[model samples]
Target: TASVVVLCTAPDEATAQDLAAKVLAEKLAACATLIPGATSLYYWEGKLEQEYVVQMILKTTVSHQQALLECLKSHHPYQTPELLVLPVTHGDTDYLSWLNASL
Candidate 1:
């Protein structure tokens, strides 16, 4: 089975945790991990901006990508939230099996 990791960013820990909890509770993602205190620099509108952000990694199967993306879009705060999906080529057999079963 194939798996995907969806990366997202939130302005604060509360938002990140809320989103993660929702995804997990809905079974959209088998697991969601949050990393805080990430400094980011990017261009928005016209000017460059820098800020601290929280990173969220959501794990799910490829078949669930569209639903998961849509869920994030509806729940996310930023006008243009950072959402990136990555394919998992390899993983532990037991974990992958669990992942497949969970989602």
Candidate 2:
């Protein structure tokens, strides 16, 4: 079973790409997939707002989720950026194997 699956959003593609590279390079995550087109609508600072964002799906284990989250929070531009984590019970065999190997 996978320890955690994190969903993080950034205002632009560049930000997401940079964070992802850091996560992988730091060995905090085995892999990350970028989903480039997302339109977000949320309320903040006394009003509602809409903005374009890029989402990243990071594949990491329980031991690394906190490290990854801290890295994201430190660099993320959003005052309260979207950072969600959940346990992943199943995945493709080869991909999961790859993930295990990387870690």
Candidate 3:
């Protein structure tokens, strides 16, 4: 079994929670953690922007990536959602098994 991660940013905890709930219910992700209070400054639409955001980290297996991406695409509020998949290179076997089993 393989563990995978997906990273996405949401405007607030409410949106993040909703997204996580749907993903989990659909079994697209085994677990999803949201880290709020991220301070981000960037340029968007040719203007400088600053934002406070919630970052959602999703966990599942690599085999589940396509389903996860599809769910994110359909459920995400933003027209172009930020859904990025990452492969787990190194990790604890026990933790990985627990993660896999917890799903």
Candidate 4:
């Protein structure tokens, strides 16, 4: 009875939308929320870099997590995309019910 929230970053709006749409179409995720204009600062190749990105939040159950990740990665433009999963400790009962049904 565990759900998960997957966090991924895209280079831009188009990439984010494409990834989200495919995942949803496959029923791998219940929902996807995209947030644009996010700033990411990290060390890459020994240089500190800052980039503008779009944040993608995906809602799904643990059962679909692995497949969803693989699907997203295969279509992602980046060689190594930022994909992280967080456990949903608790949520609104009604929303959780909907989430489970959606998946």
Q: Highest lDDT: give the candidate number.
A: 4
Candidate 2 TM-score to native:
0.86
lDDT assessment of candidate 4:
0.95
Clashes (candidate 1): 0
Candidate 4 lDDT by residue in tens digits, 1-103: 5789999999999999999999999999999999998999999899999999999999999999999999999999999799999999989999999999998
Best by TM-score: 4
lDDT of 4 at 46: 100
Superior candidate under lDDT, 1 versus 2: 1
Evaluation by TM-score, superior candidate among 3 and 4: 4
**What TM-score would each prediction reach against the true structure?**
0.94, 0.86, 0.87, 0.95
Q: List the residue pairs that clash in candidate 2.
A: none
Q: Write the per-residue lDDT of candidate 3 for residues 1-103, one digit (tens) a residue.
A: 7888999888788888899999999878888999999976889999999988888899998888888888977888878777899999979998898878866
Query: Order the candidates by TM-score, highest first — what do you get?
Result: 4, 1, 3, 2
Worst lDDT run of 10 residues, candidate 4, spans 1-10
- In candidate 1, position 85 carries an lDDT of 98
- The clash count of every prediction, one per candidate, is 0, 0, 0, 0
Which portions of model 1 miss their true places by more than 4 Å? none
Across residues 1-103, which tens digit of lDDT does each residue of candidate 1 receive?
A: 6999999999999999988898888888999999999988999798999999998999999998888887887898888798899999999999999999997
RMSD of 2: 1.7
